[model samples]
Target chain A: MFTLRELPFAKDSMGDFLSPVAFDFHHGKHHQTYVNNLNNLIKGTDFEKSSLFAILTKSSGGVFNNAAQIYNHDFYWDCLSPKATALSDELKGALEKDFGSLEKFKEDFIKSATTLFGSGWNWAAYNLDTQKIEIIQTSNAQTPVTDKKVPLLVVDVWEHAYYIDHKNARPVYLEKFYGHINWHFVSQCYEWAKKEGLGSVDYYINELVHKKL
Target chain B: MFTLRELPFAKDSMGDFLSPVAFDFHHGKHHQTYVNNLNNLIKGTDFEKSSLFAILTKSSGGVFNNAAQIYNHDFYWDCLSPKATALSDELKGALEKDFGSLEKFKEDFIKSATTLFGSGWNWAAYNLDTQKIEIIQTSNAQTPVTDKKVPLLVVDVWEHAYYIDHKNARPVYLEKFYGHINWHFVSQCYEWAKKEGLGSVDYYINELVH
Candidate 1:
């Protein structure tokens, strides 16, 4: 069974970008339940011996929902940082070349997140098809990996992600999300996407899983 | 333009069943936004002159989301009772006739609502096709009206519906939901459903729109 990891940073370190309460429920209760459910679902099946990455690639329905949510929440927490960092010149140039300017990328990504309906996530990823860094929305446990997109950054738009802090105002939460991005970690994801594509993404997931089949 | 209607009963009167904080956002802010969006979405279009139910029946995408959410929330609020109610014999007998027992119906419906992942509503509706009372779950803004099922009672399972009062414990909220059911109004809905099927369900929506 996959275990819940301590958030990459102190849960309280999110400050106003995401309050401790978001982590308390989103990570503690919500993410924990997914772990438990997946274990219960795969218990007697061959899936119990399967790597999370393997199950993720092969499963559908509840198994996919639970496993992918674990990955998504782990990635979201990693995407945030306690200390602020500036965007790397390499990533900055990529954004400017792909989306016209850093400001356009910011405006477009945040708007796409704010206007997204229902429970899900929004992503800024390197698309293998176009070799472009694109922003996309994935609804309810969906991830960009299956679409040949390597996620560089993502924001959870599920109401539970922000309802405690921002309530009905997702735009407010997303504005703060832009401010708190872990540019250092995001740049590493960029480098991986640029150089190795999805193979490396799979490698990263394998690293995250503790026990493998 | 479609408008947000006042809750059928006093908001605070729901007591432990639903807190006033839930009303402050779920009804005051969330429902109002859907009303405003449907109006703005349909402006200068044929939907501008359409009845809320007409827009509901015809539109898809954003218009359908806003319209149906408005309908769903309204029905959800209408389904709750400020004063506790006993299931009327007519409805109780219908429940017994359809599902093995009233207790079975309660267990099945609450389980369905509690287990529903993500955002949605679960309903006890009368199916025109089967001519049976059945419990259904509709994701996001989906509702039973489209499936020839007339909703008799519903509980909103959207996280916002109970997050303020119940947190991640939807089972706790759903348990409380069983107690606060506005059976008199639900009996009224059953009368309509059993008598006229989806047409009366449509008529009820027409009556609800201002």
Candidate 2:
């Protein structure tokens, strides 16, 4: 079910920061490889009868990790948009109330991300209970879903998320990453988060878990 | 690697709810496939040189998943237990403070597991940040590691985790699963979690927002 979604931004919309080389290697090659592998692994098994979510629950660890990575990366791709777009009014208002202002939020978000010690993700997520945006960092390929957090935007801080683009220089890539932030797709996710009723999200989750387990 | 771990309690240790057939099938068959497929996939590649974590990161989506599944299953196996051991003093202290005693923590943890909507894990994880046990239910194979939380103990709620044992009756399995918890193994995990400084434990996880 997790397709290789199209990039929300144009191929080279971010110009130098998102150099085609980085996007090509990161999204095109690396992320695609995961999709291809997941397809092959579950092709003939009972897992084949299940959705991507099913595959994930039934077979986490390697298969789930890989499949989820494909899913995660695909969503990451969808979440991107040319940084030039303005933040949705509702979103900005939400942010303004939650974290004071957009710029302050970015500063806080980037601070948490840059301080991360190893491979992980830096996320700008939505908290349905508080109905606010918060920033967090996760290790390796892990995401916010594991903790019941609704992810609105993510900047993969995994070395692979940036290495090809800036080598060991994470700060440089981080700088460029901020400029490449996808505002439009993020807005869509924000709206979806609202429609999904954060509470209901976990409800379906619990059912699938009980049924499958 | 994630291998199908043995039941912490003996096959007959738990009540009827945790079917012996389910335990055997979930671990013996389902988990074995992940290990077998992983070994097959990494026979002759650069993957062999990579650490399990590195492989998970580098090859998560492609040929790497085969190998990765093996590792994931292995860990999943260890997360369950057959013996009812007590948490280490340090961990117990945290759980008591965070959950108001192990029972409350367990209630939340089981709720997370029982309520999970799909194949996944309901965890009573050690949270490094809060220095306590937190309950999380994750979807699919998504792990708490994504949130930077290391797993202390896990209950495989995937149908494969209980299908053979109870058929469609997962709650029955959950009832007995309480008995097999090996606190010793979980305590051992505490050693690693503390060293890593992953303050809080993760309970639920999925791979994406969509």
Candidate 3:
């Protein structure tokens, strides 16, 4: 059974950017429901004992919806930080090389976030094939991992993510998210993916095994 | 050059069920943006002179999103009535024959509305192929008209549809929507669709030309 993870920071930690009310529903209600639904769905099925990535890779419809949302929300929580941190040198070099400059990266990210028509997420990911960082958008419970991209960071642009805090002002929400981003954690994710390599089952095995450690 | 249509009723007409604020955004900001985007998208293009159904049939990506949203929201406005009216005998008879009972139709409609994931609309449509009333759900601005299903009524289940009023309680939103439904308009839609044979290009041409 999947478990609902606690917010990485205190519910009130993000303050003006993402209020506790936002987390209370986004994490407390929305994310928890996904966890509960996944557990209920996988029961009496082969996915009962499967890892999240396994369920995500193999399923569709309700099963995939719940599993990918669980994984996405889990990653979403860790992507925010109470304190601003500088981007790591390794990831910084990658961003600069791939996107020309950090400013360009933010530009592309915001453009994608704004133009995305409906419920979805915007990602900054490590493309295993291209061996470079890329920005992508996925709609309605989709995650880049399912497409073989190693997602390093994400912004949940679902209206629920920012409706309480920013209302219709998604650009404002993206701005505040940029301010609160935990670059240290994102860089670590990129480094880990680089070390593990792509398409190797060990990468996922290690990911699950080392999640708590 | 499309214009944002006024809400079928006054903004505050629905009172507790749908607030003026909801209309201000849903119709004013959200629906208006789709119209504006559609106009901008079709300018100087072949789609400029095309009908909404025409634009939807031939387009993909951004064009499809804007065109379908425009039609969906237009239909959604008429689907609501400030005061609940009696179900027409014709529509009521069809409902009983197709869904077994009016209660069953509501049950299925509410079920689809509650279970629909992400942003979408739940429709009570006239299925031309099956010649029956069916409930359908389409995600992120999709409209049943695209698939040749004649839509009679819709409930916009997108988060923006009810987040301010109901929060996560979608079942509550669906219940209130039932109270304010425009059965009179729905019955008219069904009668019109029945009169015009499905696959009769006349339906589309009259719907466009007339």
For each candidate, what's the DockQ?
Answer: 0.77, 0.02, 0.62
Model 2 per-residue lDDT tens digits across residues A45-105 = 7777676655654576657767667656756665565664567888888888888998898
Worst 10 residues of 1 chain A by lDDT: A204-213
Give the alpha carbon lDDT tens digit for every residue of B12-101 in model 2. Answer: 555544556545655566556666666566668777555556555457553454443444455555555545667789777777888788
Off by over 4 Å in 2: A1-3, A56-59, A198-213, B1-210
Cα lDDT, model 3, residue A148: 78
Judging by TM-score, tell me the better candidate of 1 and 2: 1
Name the better of 2 and 3 by lDDT.
3
> Residue-wise lDDT of candidate 1 within A1-213, one digit each (tens)?
778767888878878878888789988999899889999999999898898878887898899899889888888887888875778899999999999998999999999998888889999999887888999999888999877789999999988988898888889999888888899878988988888888767877777544343
lDDT of 1 by residue, B63-102 (tens): 9999999999888888988787777788989999998898
- All models: lDDT? 0.87, 0.63, 0.83
Provide the lDDT at B159 for model 1.
89
Q: Per-prediction interface RMSD?
A: 0.8, 15.8, 1.1
True lDDT of residue B39, candidate 1: 92
Candidate 2 interface RMSD value:
15.8
Residue lDDT tens for model 3, A1-213: 667886779988886998888888999999999989999999999998787767887899999999889878888888899987778899989999999999999899889988887899999988888898889899989988877778888999988888877778899999999889999988878887787654432354336522434
What iRMS does model 1 reach? 0.8
Model 3 vs. true fold: TM: 0.92
